[PDB]
Subunit: 211 residues, 4 copies
């Protein structure tokens, strides 16, 4: 139903020397997958798609600490679309905090708080990347608890991985191979935030940016 | 330095001079600060921030009321400055979420909601980011909370500081703009979920104050 | 009829340390007058105003070598407005080269070439700054020669100076004091091109950036 | 390096994936290069340009057919790199205007119009900027003209190089993207004054080729 921009397993992304990359990350990356500008353009069409469905009303729900970058960009584009409406349209930003921990055995989620502003509203879940689908599934049954009118998921990234298949996202920026990516929205123990593009972390970068 | 001082004298900018959404044509008095002006100042603030806190870790803490547009923007420029460093410097981004109470007759009373492991701040260099400071009571009482977790040093940055007799004297370390004692909306400041799509800082008109009130 | 954003003689512009300025220009400027971002915003409203009048058709006329920056920015905003039209709208960019020389006595203008694409069209003259008004007056009688349907002038800058008063511009970005400005569109013997803001050149900068 | 190689294999991007003006909904086949992608590559090109020509003067010469969007953009990124230099490095920006003839069956025949004091180029470091190279005949004969004024060194930069058997083998020094042998519009390439407002490089469809023809 729109798998988004499909980046296939075969020969993925771009050679490092084709784009501008912070020099201090020269050894910490393997290839580049999605240049920043390309993320921007897709995010724009995405915002157009969100208004089609949404817009009764809209509550955009950010996932805190981590997800702020993509949320901000997605919302900037929506604001950009909203400037031309003949009646000014109310829009509410919301926030859940959510942290995950490496598991022996079973998944660990630590949630969020104060979600009164959801009752009978159109709620958009914004995520950064979908791998196992647990974050999405958690955010789901959580908002379902507060009796909203509508619920969609938007996620910049869907990884091509084994999952329980539970709730397939409604809006997908990019469908990428099973590789570990950083930059743009995704840090690695606080590094790569200054990296605008989504790139594959290398082995040098993994060992260098400890934890 | 008190930032870009916008005078009581001749206020800001006539409305037809800049691009504004048709649906607010009636809901504003003046433009104080066009979007591009906010960006240019913010770029400078970010430079100023790296001068005093650069190299060291820094934890960027966003005072999160209704939105964080300013924070997002300050942090993009800061990330842009860090693109050059020989060593990549880890940047910790966090949020402290505040819910609004008694309207605004006593803003010094904070009710923090998004207050995860506040003890991360300890022994760390904290930059606290705010969008507007008015009476100064929110911040001064937020400072009291943050300092009890003993950071290595705290600096505050505010896009806008309002020049009011109702001020309790608290001055941020970094000021974007010092503005007249009038109620503003736009860029980062919403009004009952409105003006989110307004790029500029403009004074809210009375027909707009009434059309959009809770 | 819209004097544009009036920057008065009294206490003009901003202190240098309030904005980001290339370090190698630290001594070469006095104050800053119009930050880049501010130029952008005004240029946007300007593009909106141009479409009101123009749009039958439109030929935007750039003044070559010098004027490319502002033209490009003004046109980018117009393109941005044109995306939403229900019928795609043809737009023609044109070019005259024009150079001036310090005068003994009388003005020197060296013109341009190939302006067949003007007959019965709506022509916009784009300039960078208006001081004496000779450039504007020259561009005027020049296009008048090719029997256009319409003629307007847009200029980012109008200086508050003695002039022959001949043809007052239709669109004006900013009305600035009688000071010598550089940056954004205005170089000084090839310097300040990397400067985004319009600032007053200092005496140190004048003597340093020779000729 | 032949730039970002876009394959003959799977072309570019489906139209509904990106934002495109409604009035061209029918006039395109595929998107090859979204605007943001063009910006990111161009940023890199500019870096590459300063590596080999940095510090020295450089005269940036724009091959000006219908527009100069690419040139303007390359030069903004170059100016952005020069913001850091200890000495400010003077940059000379010039244009060489070419009018189109015999349609395009013999593009090697240039007719230069905007050719002011060509003898400025002499003893100077020239970067020649072009938006697309197809058969390569325009450039190779432009090179012959420019070299007769004996510069100190000439480099060429092209946003797009088309991979065609009709190519005479000329390769620019700097390539943005190497693309399939299909007729493209958008970003910098207009079609009879159309697609100026199209941000992306997209293949022109046949219903668009006909609706917009001279
Ligand atoms: N930076 C970075 N993080 C990754 C990546 N893959 C997983 N993660 C961990 C966070 O994403 C979890 C989503 P889920 O709840 O498993 O659906 C990655 O490719 N880059
Ligand atoms: N949008 C908008 N909000 C305003 C304004 N003034 C106060 N507020 C409320 C938030 O600022 C209070 C912080 P404080 O504790 O008083 O320093 C305003 O002029 N615009
Ligand atoms: N950089 C720079 N140049 C200036 C300035 N003032 C004049 N000039 C010279 C070019 O402008 C001539 C316009 P005219 O034909 O006299 O109406 C200036 O304040 N900065
Ligand atoms: N818009 C557009 N124009 C094209 C295209 N192909 C050729 N042209 C004409 C200009 O390029 C010719 C230069 P050359 O001398 O052949 O190297 C195209 O695919 N799109």
């Amino acid at each position: 139903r729109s798998p988004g921009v499909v980046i296939s397993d075969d020969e993925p992304g771009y050679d490092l020397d084709l784009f501008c990359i912070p020099n201090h990350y020269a050894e910490d990356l393997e290839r580049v997958f999605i240049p920043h500008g390309l993320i921007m353009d897709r995010t724009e069409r995405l915002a157009r798609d969100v208004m089609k469905e949404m817009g009764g009303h809209i509550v955009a729900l950010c996932v805190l600490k981590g997800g702020y970058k993509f949320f901000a960009d997605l919302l900037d584009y929506i604001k950009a679309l909203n400037r031309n409406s003949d009646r000014s349209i109310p829009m509410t930003v919301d926030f859940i905090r959510l942290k995950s921990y490496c598991n022996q055995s079973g998944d660990i989620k630590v949630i969020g708080d104060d979600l009164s502003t959801l009752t009978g509203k159109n709620v958009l879940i914004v995520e950064d990347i979908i791998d196992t689908g647990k974050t999405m599934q958690t955010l789901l049954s959580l908002v379902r608890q507060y009796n909203p009118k509508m619920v969609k998921v938007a996620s910049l990234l869907v990884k091509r991985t084994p999952r329980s298949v539970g709730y397939k996202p409604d809006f997908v920026g990019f469908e990428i191979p099973d590789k570990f990516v950083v930059g743009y929205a995704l840090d690695y123990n606080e590094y790569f935030r200054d990296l605008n593009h989504v790139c594959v972390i290398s082995e040098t970068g993994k060992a260098k940016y400890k934890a």
